[PDB]
Amino acid sequence: TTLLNPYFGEFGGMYVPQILMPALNQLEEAFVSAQKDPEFQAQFADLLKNYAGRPTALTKCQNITAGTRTTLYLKREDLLHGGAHKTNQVLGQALLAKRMGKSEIIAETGAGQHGVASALASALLGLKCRIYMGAKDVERQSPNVFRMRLMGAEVIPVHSGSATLKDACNEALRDWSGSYETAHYMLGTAAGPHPYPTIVREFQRMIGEETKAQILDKEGRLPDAVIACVGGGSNAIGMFADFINDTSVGLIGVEPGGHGIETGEHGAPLKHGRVGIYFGMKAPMMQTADGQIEESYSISAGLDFPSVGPQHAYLNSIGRADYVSITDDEALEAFKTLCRHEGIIPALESSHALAHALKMMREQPEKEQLLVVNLAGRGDKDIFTVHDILKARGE
Amino acid sequence: TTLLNPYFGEFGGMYVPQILMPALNQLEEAFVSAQKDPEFQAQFADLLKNYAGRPTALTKCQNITAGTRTTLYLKREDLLHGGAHKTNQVLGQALLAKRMGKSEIIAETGAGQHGVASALASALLGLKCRIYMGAKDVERQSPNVFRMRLMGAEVIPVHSGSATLKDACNEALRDWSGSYETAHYMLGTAAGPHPYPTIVREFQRMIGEETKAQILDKEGRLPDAVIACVGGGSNAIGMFADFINDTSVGLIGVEPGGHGIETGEHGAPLKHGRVGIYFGMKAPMMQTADGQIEESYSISAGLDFPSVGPQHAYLNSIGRADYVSITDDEALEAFKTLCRHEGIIPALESSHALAHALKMMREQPEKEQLLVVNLAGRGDKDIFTVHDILKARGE
Amino acid sequence: ERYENLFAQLNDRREGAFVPFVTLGDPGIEQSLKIIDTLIDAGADALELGVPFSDPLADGPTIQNANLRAFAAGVTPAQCFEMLALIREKHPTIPIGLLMYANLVFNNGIDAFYARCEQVGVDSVLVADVPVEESAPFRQAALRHNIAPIFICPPNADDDLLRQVASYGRGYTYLLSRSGVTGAENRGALPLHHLIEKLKEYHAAPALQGFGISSPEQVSAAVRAGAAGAISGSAIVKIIEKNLASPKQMLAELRSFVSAMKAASRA
Amino acid sequence: ERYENLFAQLNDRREGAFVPFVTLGDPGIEQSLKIIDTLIDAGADALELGVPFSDPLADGPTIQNANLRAFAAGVTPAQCFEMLALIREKHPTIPIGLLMYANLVFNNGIDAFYARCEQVGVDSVLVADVPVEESAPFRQAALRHNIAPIFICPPNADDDLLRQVASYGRGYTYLLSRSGVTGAENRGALPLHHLIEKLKEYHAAPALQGFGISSPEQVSAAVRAGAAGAISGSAIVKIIEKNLASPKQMLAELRSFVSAMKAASRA
Ligand SMILES: O=P(O)(O)OCCNS(=O)(=O)c1ccc(OC(F)(F)F)cc1
Ligand SMILES: O=P(O)(O)OCCNS(=O)(=O)c1ccc(OC(F)(F)F)cc1
Ligand SMILES: *Cc1c(COP(=O)(O)O)cnc(C)c1O
Ligand SMILES: *Cc1c(COP(=O)(O)O)cnc(C)c1O
Ligand SMILES: N[C@@H](Cc1c[nH]c2ccccc12)C(=O)O
Ligand SMILES: N[C@@H](Cc1c[nH]c2ccccc12)C(=O)O
Ligand SMILES: N[C@@H](Cc1c[nH]c2ccccc12)C(=O)O
Ligand SMILES: N[C@@H](Cc1c[nH]c2ccccc12)C(=O)O
Ligand SMILES: [Cl-]
Ligand SMILES: [Cl-]
Ligand SMILES: [Cl-]
Ligand SMILES: [Cl-]
Ligand SMILES: [Cl-]
Ligand SMILES: [Cl-]
Ligand SMILES: [Cl-]
Ligand SMILES: [Cl-]
Ligand SMILES: [Cl-]
Ligand SMILES: [Cl-]
Ligand SMILES: [Cl-]
Ligand SMILES: [Cl-]
Ligand SMILES: [Cl-]
Ligand SMILES: [Cl-]
Ligand SMILES: [Cl-]
Ligand SMILES: [Cl-]
Ligand SMILES: [Cl-]
Ligand SMILES: [Cl-]
Ligand SMILES: [Cl-]
Ligand SMILES: [Cl-]
Ligand SMILES: [Cl-]
Ligand SMILES: [Cl-]
Ligand SMILES: [Cl-]
Ligand SMILES: [Cl-]
Ligand SMILES: [Cl-]
Ligand SMILES: [Cl-]
Ligand SMILES: [Cl-]
Ligand SMILES: [Cl-]
Ligand SMILES: [Cl-]
Ligand SMILES: [Cl-]
Ligand SMILES: [Cl-]
Ligand SMILES: [Cl-]
Ligand SMILES: [Cl-]
Ligand SMILES: [Cl-]
Ligand SMILES: [Cl-]
Ligand SMILES: [Cl-]
Ligand SMILES: [Cl-]
Ligand SMILES: [Cl-]
Ligand SMILES: [Cl-]
Ligand SMILES: [Cl-]
Ligand SMILES: [Cl-]
Ligand SMILES: [Cl-]
Ligand SMILES: [Cl-]
Ligand SMILES: [Cl-]
Ligand SMILES: [Cl-]
Ligand SMILES: [Cl-]
Ligand SMILES: [Cs+]
Ligand SMILES: [Cs+]
Ligand SMILES: [Cs+]
Ligand SMILES: [Cs+]
Ligand SMILES: [Cs+]
Ligand SMILES: [Cs+]
């Protein structure tokens, strides 16, 4: 029994061991309570403004669209403290942990960004933070691991399974299964068991709310479409939520196409996977024929996960949102384009969203369209990866 | 003959070859004109808000001052696009270049941050950008060099003299001496010949103006002191300018003490150098006994320069501002402290300012004092340097 | 029916059930089949058998490693079902329960999963990541195919949960020793006799205590508290892990351990 | 007085002045002294001599490298002044002008700098990074010590600048060939006869054209346009750079070059 529907249509639910159900029920109640609590909301707003730096800019990108009938704005989550949108929801989850009387945080991370965001919120708010990270990810993300440790978090390598993000997700839940009376699990995306898809959306919805106000102020109308990449679904649902009832506004989610859909080396389960049950939810995933959870792939670590949040699968099924893919090479081109034409270095994740917008513009350059790309992160973290690819190409 | 006084007391002036005097006169006129031009001001405000993300947060740091009578705020220039305060003035200088009908930018850089800021402004505003950088700096700042090149700037190693920042400064002026009809020199600090100390101050003064409004709103009074590190003087004068006439407000500038003043391995000319004439100005510098310009030193590359802007030397001489030094080890401690207690990774430059504030607090923990540190940059760029020091120490 | 028959016979002998867990195909198919026959010959009353899965999020490191060993041997669910058919073909009456994760059950259709269980002669299925709140399509498919759905009764169960588990479950009720995940390294720390009594009041399937059972005294304790018996997994699997280099010593130690644990069920 | 005497004598011979520049102590003190004596013996009418400085921001790469060579040889300003005293002790009447940067003049006091110049027998000082706008304390100290302050007349000089340079300067007026920094690789591209005429109208010190002069035809061109002569630096220094490995060939080539350049001043 729950306060809120755990499902979006057929997708979602609460597929956790029985032992964890009280943990989820407690969290759901504390969330519903917090959402009615002016004191909670004021504390959250205070952190978002004075610590994280909200509101974020909405930047008009004139050079990149010159000589077309596209007007493109970028919502600048890359300017948020931490350099990605994740900071918004970790602040809210940290406040929920305090609300429930917990003093410890558990988090999973793959690329390391969620680990950093969890650690920073925990440092600020006086919570002990332990982060699980697949050993292969620990090996490849030394900079982020060091950042987590500077902020006083414990970083725990996970050697089980495939030693990557899904294995870290498992380990986080294993720990929580035995510690939830004292520790909160700060899940890093709008996926997993209810109530996380709901909470993460609500704690990211300021992205779309601000975008709506800013676009009305600047253009006097709503956008024709808003475009965001989809790793687990948080930045995208944060941009989308406030526009869901504005049915003239297109909602476009971009999954990583990796080396190409046809190669099987991608991270696009919503459109190219198969519904399964894993990480507490019924959702599209990448899996073997006999139902083992598969290895995902993207040039961008932030996108490299074999599933997707349930609200995206739902919005897709009813045709409210459209989902597309962008390959490594298309993302790389968009990355280089933004650097050179706008003086902004985007996250390779965000480069997927921008790449799709550039395709919308280039394919139909005489179509009048007002687009917003959610620039969810900056790309300083990616310059080594990009350097190494460009070098191998002899560019 | 000039429109404005080129001197602050005895410091400053226009010590350039005769050939460059028309370039300086033109720039001064264009600046004075721009400062009266509502259209210029609106364009500048538009870039600062919608592209750079102004206004920046003022963050109250409660964990770090617990159990003392210090209240500490950080002015969050680390959240500005580019991750340092330099973005503010490069936008204004780029607009001046356009005002004068120039389509090319020349810039010097040492640490590489000014190079990045110059390149980003140039990319956005359609200007060709060439950056001079001492070959030794090019070797040690591969990440920033790559960032400049991604944004389409040309980066030109300088092999003359000591192959570092002063040598890059020389080369920039050499180039300008032969190109000023078509190119603007985007000098990177509030130093050099008039009118640069004036222009850079005015294009950074929003830091202090916002700080004043934000502190009045939050505390109902002006700060007891505002504290900023001093590399060439830009972030500090930007924080100070709006408070100069508020004579109850302390203005504290922090020079890098390096391995210690007594070792001679530092970058603190204002207090430990000797007045000289170099880089177009009469100012304190680090020099040999026979007047060769000396090698400066700091753990932080952003601070490692053997001179200082003339307005600082002036404010010091009249006793309006006080200047102090902080050593590498004190800066490192402040860096680690902020990461762990506030979840903010500061620039090693900014860590010097924070270190002095922590000393003000710790030395006199029962003194009621309201301090603002100008957090001029974020420290992602520094985590390798810090890692390597902590490792050598076996921490 | 196999559980009902077993519990009635054990009741007549005033005995608890001793129920080992192993991962099917750990460390390979052939050695796994020998392991399982050894467990039975040494006195196992029933079996709990895991199908190797990529993401066993209710399992501690011992059983994580068992899954990894089976994968290293190339063991697939299809091969596991071949194994199960052969196990039942060898042993007519022993109850065989599977420990599953939801995706393996859902993968080719929930109904078809339980139909295959019925075809090979499985008796119960416990899906570790499906709580009672989500159990409806699993328990329905189970019962349609004469498979007992196994429900978990946690130490912190409220009355409504006790009533649900009592009502929907068949075969046995899983009585969790403690919070956390499987492992012999963590022993249960709470008396469970109250839950056992409430389960009996509500006519639940007989309780088997599981998690952290690694010693004869814990088996006897389970029986003394009123449970019908006890499950031991990690302790068994550790013997496999320890003895990978000597299949002969492995089987010897498995025999001694199961024999001792079964001896403790007298009471 | 040495400049006034030289220009009067050259006027009588209808000759231009040829004035080489070298860096003092490039490539070492002893070879530098031999270089300078060679320049004189081959027909230099006056000298421009640079004191090695860390930041020569009016100089292109050729003279940047000359400064670096002198530093590699450990040459200091004090040693340069010892050299200058010896040069004057050898040559009574040749005008000796220094090319300085402001910090070297300011370092131990402006007045003391020019007092030392007077003591060693220097005739003029050009401070490359001090424009007329900042010149007052330098020109005053110069004149107090009987040193000619050398002012730069750029190609883009307005009337006020011409009047200032004419009024404050002594010895010679430096007539810049072009924008940019020293170097033989860039030739001046503008006729300067108008500036030369205006300087004469205003009773300025005689003009020497400098920057990018590397060829006899440029010397003759300077004289034909009405200038009193021409300065050549980078072209001279390149001969040093080219011949570091053979001091004998270096001096031979310096002699041939200066001889040819001086020959061109006939007119
Ligand atoms: O002896 P241990 O501690 O290794 O425990 C044995 C466990 N083996 S099992 O198949 O009963 C079993 C039963 C339930 C499990 O998870 C769940 F409770 F969430 F459903 C996991 C494994
Ligand atoms: O032949 P080149 O092109 O090497 O030029 C020779 C220059 N040697 S110099 O001492 O006259 C000389 C004169 C003026 C200089 O700069 C200034 F104009 F700014 F003052 C620099 C050098
Ligand atoms: C984490 C991250 C993503 C992917 O995660 P979502 O939950 O799908 O948003 C995408 N972009 C950036 C910049 C991220 O930091
Ligand atoms: C560039 C820089 C400095 C030093 O330069 P100033 O002109 O003195 O401000 C200090 N801090 C940061 C973060 C910088 O980027
Ligand atoms: N791998 C990214 C984003 C992420 C965190 N948790 C996730 C869960 C599912 C999908 C993506 C994520 C990070 O750790 O920063
Ligand atoms: N070295 C720093 C700051 C800087 C730029 N120009 C300067 C001139 C003087 C002193 C410091 C600077 C950078 O390049 O980013
Ligand atoms: N600490 C014991 C007992 C316990 C406390 N709170 C619990 C909640 C659920 C289950 C058990 C417990 C355990 O984790 O098992
Ligand atoms: N291009 C030539 C002529 C010239 C054009 N504009 C100038 C301004 C100043 C001096 C010279 C010039 C030079 O640089 O010399
Ligand atoms: Cl649906
Ligand atoms: Cl449903
Ligand atoms: Cl709300
Ligand atoms: Cl609300
Ligand atoms: Cl990396
Ligand atoms: Cl590192
Ligand atoms: Cl650390
Ligand atoms: Cl392992
Ligand atoms: Cl509204
Ligand atoms: Cl409008
Ligand atoms: Cl798949
Ligand atoms: Cl299959
Ligand atoms: Cl809808
Ligand atoms: Cl394609
Ligand atoms: Cl003064
Ligand atoms: Cl003055
Ligand atoms: Cl103004
Ligand atoms: Cl104004
Ligand atoms: Cl580095
Ligand atoms: Cl690089
Ligand atoms: Cl590039
Ligand atoms: Cl060189
Ligand atoms: Cl005001
Ligand atoms: Cl107040
Ligand atoms: Cl010094
Ligand atoms: Cl001296
Ligand atoms: Cl004052
Ligand atoms: Cl000290
Ligand atoms: Cl036996
Ligand atoms: Cl088989
Ligand atoms: Cl199957
Ligand atoms: Cl139900
Ligand atoms: Cl019921
Ligand atoms: Cl556990
Ligand atoms: Cl536990
Ligand atoms: Cl109990
Ligand atoms: Cl009994
Ligand atoms: Cl001769
Ligand atoms: Cl000598
Ligand atoms: Cl001297
Ligand atoms: Cl004057
Ligand atoms: Cl005059
Ligand atoms: Cl030049
Ligand atoms: Cl030129
Ligand atoms: Cl002319
Ligand atoms: Cl003539
Ligand atoms: Cs456009
Ligand atoms: Cs994904
Ligand atoms: Cs305090
Ligand atoms: Cs300095
Ligand atoms: Cs029952
Ligand atoms: Cs004169």
For every residue of chain C, which 3-state class applies, written as one string? CHHHHHHHHHHHCCECEEEEEEECCCCCHHHHHHHHHHHHHHCCCCEEEECCCCCCCCECHHHHHHHHHHHHCCCCHHHHHHHHHHHHHHCCCCCEEEEECHHHHHCCCHHHHHHHHHHHCCCEEEECCCCHHHCHHHHHHHHHCCCEECCEECCCCCHHHHHHHHHHCCCCEEEECCCCCECCCCCCCCCCHHHHHHHHHCCCCCEEEECCCCCHHHHHHHHHCCCCEEEECHHHHHHHHHCCCCHHHHHHHHHHHHHHHHHCCEC
User: Can you list the domains of chain C with their CATH numbers?
Assistant: 1-267 (3.20.20.70)
Ligand 2, pocket residues at CB < 6 Å = B 17; D 21, 48, 58, 63, 99, 126, 128, 152, 176, 182-184, 210-213, 231-234
Percent helix, percent strand, percent coil in chain B, to nearest 5: 45, 20, 30
The two three-digit tokens of residue D3, written as one number: 């400049």
The two three-digit tokens of residue A142, written as one number: 């030394």
Could you give phi then psi for residue B319, rounded to 5 degrees? 75, 20
Contact B28, B195 (CB under 8 A): yes
Report the candidate in A249, A248, A250, A268 with the shortest Cα–Cα distance to residue A258.
Answer: A268
The two three-digit tokens of residue D41, written as one number: 């013996």
3-state DSSP assignment of residue B36: coil
Q: What count of other Cβ atoms lies within 10 Å of the Cβ of residue D190?
A: 12
Distance from C-alpha of D109 to C-alpha of D115, rounded to nearest angstrom: 10
Burial of B60 (0-12, 13-18, 19+ CB in 10 A): middle
Q: In this complex, do B161 and D181 lie within 8 Å of one another by their Cβ atoms? A: no
Contact A252, A322 (CB under 8 A): yes
Helices B383-392 & A142-150 angle (0-180, nearest 10): 70
Distance from C-alpha of B306 to C-alpha of B191, rounded to nearest angstrom: 12
Pairing verdict, β A70-76 and B280-285: unpaired
Ligand 4, pocket residues at CB < 6 Å = B 84, 86, 113, 189, 229-236, 302-303, 347, 349-350, 376-377
Distance from C-alpha of D59 to C-alpha of B174, rounded to nearest angstrom: 8
Distance from C-alpha of A92 to C-alpha of D242, rounded to nearest angstrom: 71
Report the candidate in D81, D82, D112 with the shortest Cα–Cα distance to residue D98.
Answer: D81
- Method used for this model? X-ray
Residue A91 CA, distance from chain mean position: 15
Which residues in chain C have Cβ-Cβ distances shorter than 8 Å to A290?
A: 76-78, 104, 107-108
Distance from C-alpha of C95 to C-alpha of C4, rounded to nearest angstrom: 9
Could you give phi then psi for residue D141, rounded to 5 degrees? -60, -40
What string of DSSP letters covers A182-209?
A: TEEE---SS-SSTTHHHHHHHTTTHHHH
Q: Is the CB of A75 under 6 A from ligand 5?
A: no
The residue whose CA has the least distance to atom 15 of ligand 2 is D128
Identity of the residue in D53, D108, D154 whose CB atom sits nearest the CB atom of B18? D154
Q: In this complex, do A276 and C106 lie within 8 Å of one another by their Cβ atoms? A: yes
Report the candidate in A171, A158, A183, A187 with the shortest Cα–Cα distance to residue A281.
Answer: A187
Tell me how close the Cα of B146 comes to any Cα of chain A, in angstroms: 8
Considering only alpha carbons, which residue of chain B is nearest residue A83?
A: B79
**HSE-up of residue D250 (Cα within 13 Å, Cβ side):** 20
Q: In this complex, do C103 and A174 lie within 8 Å of one another by their Cβ atoms? A: no
* Cross-strand partners of A265: A260
Q: How distant, in Å, are the alpha carbons of A136, A230, D189 from that of A164?
A: 6, 18, 67
Q: Find the ligand nearest to A14 CA.
A: 10
Q: What contacts A66, CB < 8 A, 6 or more positions away?
A: none
* Cross-strand partners of A274: A285
**HSE-up of residue C164 (Cα within 13 Å, Cβ side):** 18
Q: What count of other Cβ atoms lies within 10 Å of the Cβ of residue A25?
A: 17
Burial of C161 (0-12, 13-18, 19+ CB in 10 A): buried
Extents of the domains making up chain B: 14-48+86-201, 54-83+205-392
Distance from C-alpha of C173 to C-alpha of C97, rounded to nearest angstrom: 12
CA of C111 to the centre of ligand 56 (A): 29
Residues, chain D: 267
Contact B14, D134 (CB under 8 A): yes
Contact A138, A155 (CB under 8 A): yes
Residue A303 CA, distance from chain mean position: 8
The residue whose CA has the least distance to atom 10 of ligand 5 is A232
Q: Is D241 a catalytic residue?
A: no
The two three-digit tokens of residue A22, written as one number: 């009280």
Burial of A220 (0-12, 13-18, 19+ CB in 10 A): exposed
Amino acid at B292: Q
Among A81, A85, A352, A356, the one annotated catalytic: A85
The two three-digit tokens of residue C8, written as one number: 């009635």
Identity of the residue in A22, A180, A291 whose CB atom sits nearest the CB atom of C104? A291
Q: In this complex, do A50 and B63 lie within 8 Å of one another by their Cβ atoms? A: no
DSSP single-letter state for residue A49? I
Which residues in chain D have Cβ-Cβ distances shorter than 8 Å to B22?
A: 156
Distance from C-alpha of B171 to C-alpha of D57, rounded to nearest angstrom: 7
Residue C242 CA, distance from chain mean position: 21
Q: In this complex, do A57 and B51 lie within 8 Å of one another by their Cβ atoms? A: yes
CA of D256 to the centre of ligand 52 (A): 28
Amino acid at C192: L
The two three-digit tokens of residue B126, written as one number: 């359609």
How is domain A54-83+205-392 classified at the architecture level of CATH? 3-Layer(aba) Sandwich (3.40)
Which residues in chain A have Cβ-Cβ distances shorter than 8 Å to C102?
A: 15, 277-278
Burial of B39 (0-12, 13-18, 19+ CB in 10 A): exposed
Distance from C-alpha of B290 to C-alpha of B286, rounded to nearest angstrom: 11
Q: How distant, in Å, are the alpha carbons of A138, B229, B309, D122 from that of B265?
A: 37, 17, 20, 37
* Cross-strand partners of A73: A60, A372
Distance from C-alpha of B242 to C-alpha of C177, rounded to nearest angstrom: 67
Interface probe with B: pick from D23, D24, D53, D55, most Cβ of B within 10 Å: D55
Work out whether the CA dihedral C124, C127, C131, C137 comes out positive or negative: negative
Q: What contacts A286, CB < 8 A, 6 or more positions away?
A: A267, A269, A272, A273, A274, A293, A294, A295, A296, A306, A307
Q: In this complex, do A174 and C181 lie within 8 Å of one another by their Cβ atoms? A: yes
Q: Is the CB of A316 under 6 A from ligand 5?
A: no
Report the candidate in A44, A64, A63, A62 with the shortest Cα–Cα distance to residue A54.
Answer: A44
Q: Which atom of ligand 3 is nearest to the CA of A77?
A: 13
Q: CA end-to-end span of chain C, whole Å?
A: 24
Within this chain, domains A15-48+86-201 and A54-83+205-392 share the same CATH topology: yes
B114-134 exposure pattern, b = at least 16 Cβ within 10 A, e = fewer: bbbbbbbbbbbbebebbbbbb
CB of A390 within 8 Å of a chain B CB? The answer is: no
Distance from C-alpha of A108 to C-alpha of B14, rounded to nearest angstrom: 58
Identity of the residue in A15, A167, A178 whose CB atom sits nearest the CB atom of C130? A15
Distance from C-alpha of B35 to C-alpha of D247, rounded to nearest angstrom: 59
Output the CATH code of domain B14-48+86-201: 3.40.50.1100
Amino acid at C62: T
Contact D171, D3 (CB under 8 A): yes
* Cross-strand partners of A324: A254
Amino acid at B101: G
Identity of the residue in B160, B170, B177 whose CB atom sits nearest the CB atom of D180? B177
The two three-digit tokens of residue B55, written as one number: 């206004």
* Cross-strand partners of B128: B104
> To which H or E segment does residue A269 belong?
helix A269-272
The two three-digit tokens of residue B221, written as one number: 């009074």
Report the candidate in B146, B102, B120, B143 with the shortest Cα–Cα distance to residue B52.
Answer: B120
Q: Is D48 a catalytic residue?
A: yes
CA of B333 to the centre of ligand 15 (A): 11
Ligand 8, pocket residues at CB < 6 Å = B 178, 181; D 154-156, 178-179, 189-190
**Radius of gyration of chain B, Cα coordinates, nearest whole angstrom:** 20
Helices C77-90 & C110-120 angle (0-180, nearest 10): 30
Q: How distant, in Å, are the alpha carbons of B17, B177, D128 from that of D192?
A: 19, 19, 21
Contact C192, C212 (CB under 8 A): no
Distance from C-alpha of B314 to C-alpha of B5, rounded to nearest angstrom: 13
Amino acid at A21: M
Pairing verdict, β B250-258 and B322-327: parallel
Q: What count of other Cβ atoms lies within 10 Å of the Cβ of residue D74?
A: 11
> To which H or E segment does residue D65 belong?
helix D61-72
Identity of the residue in B15, B167, B178 whose CB atom sits nearest the CB atom of D129? B15
Distance from C-alpha of B89 to C-alpha of B121, rounded to nearest angstrom: 10
Tell me how close the Cα of A21 comes to any Cα of chain B, in angstroms: 32
Q: What contacts C143, CB < 8 A, 6 or more positions away?
A: C149, C170
DSSP single-letter state for residue A18? G
3-state DSSP assignment of residue A354: helix
Q: Is the CB of B110 under 6 A from ligand 6?
A: yes
Q: What contacts A209, CB < 8 A, 6 or more positions away?
A: A242
User: What's this structure's resolution in Å?
Assistant: 1.5
Residue C94 CA, distance from chain mean position: 12
Distance from C-alpha of C37 to C-alpha of C88, rounded to nearest angstrom: 11
User: CATH classification of A15-48+86-201 is 3.40.50.720, yes or no?
Assistant: no
Report the candidate in B20, B170, B195, B165 with the shortest Cα–Cα distance to residue D180.
Answer: B20
Q: What contacts D18, CB < 8 A, 6 or more positions away?
A: D43, D44, D45, D219, D229, D230, D232, D258, D261, D262, D264, D265
* Cross-strand partners of B74: B59, B373
Amino acid at C41: D
Report the candidate in D9, D2, D212, D259 with the shortest Cα–Cα distance to residue D122.
Answer: D2
